[PDB]
Structure 1
Amino acid sequence: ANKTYKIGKNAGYDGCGLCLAAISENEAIKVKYLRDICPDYDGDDKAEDWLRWGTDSRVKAAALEMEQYAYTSVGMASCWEFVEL
């Protein structure tokens, strides 16, 4: 599928990168970048990196917190859009 959503203006956008996004009313209302969740992620924001990093305990904890209020998925921020991966 790879659904795509506009990232909202108060979501924490910081350019392109792998991120978690909380989706509400067809918009990514909050993004949290992998490079911020996991300071030791020094990769290049390649889509396939989520297979390794999706199971990191810090990613799991961040996603659980977002799921408290909205549908949450891993994906890619790019050009003000969130693409589910």
Structure 2
Amino acid sequence: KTYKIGKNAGYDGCGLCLAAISENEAIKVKYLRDICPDYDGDDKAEDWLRWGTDSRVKAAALEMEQYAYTSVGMASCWEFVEL
């Protein structure tokens, strides 16, 4: 599933990210490379097997989930794809 990333959502190019989704749009994104500065992968979906249970990723997701449906995925050309 694919969702447009708005212009005030924190977009910063391609990368694995969390997204908050509301009314068919990703209204906030948070990149794995910012949540976890020690992340050194090449943005492969399989990287979430390693990083998805990181306490920093869990904390970032819980903060967004208070307010909107949240999921792990990948950002590319202003679109968020759910993984």
* Fold in common (TM above 0.5): yes
Aligned equivalents of 1:15 and 1:47: distance in 2?
Answer: 16
Aligned equivalents of 2:22 and 2:58: distance in 1?
Answer: 20
Structure 2: 5+ residue runs without aligned partners?
none
C-alpha deviation, 1:42, in angstroms: 1.1
- The share of aligned pairs that are identical, in percent, is 100
Task: Give the 3-state SS of the residue equivalent to 2:58 in structure 1.
Answer: helix
Aligned equivalents of 1:27 and 1:48: distance in 2?
Answer: 24
Aligned residue pairs, count: 83
List per-residue Cα deviations over 1:32-80 (Å, max 9, x = no partner): 0000000000111111101110000000000000001100000000010
C-alpha deviation, 1:24, in angstroms: 0.5
**From 74, 78, 82, the counterpart of 2:72:** 74
Aligned equivalents of 1:46 and 1:54: distance in 2?
Answer: 12
RMSD: 0.5
Query: Runs (4+) of structure 1 moved beyond 6 Å?
Result: none
Aligned equivalents of 1:51 and 1:58: distance in 2?
Answer: 14
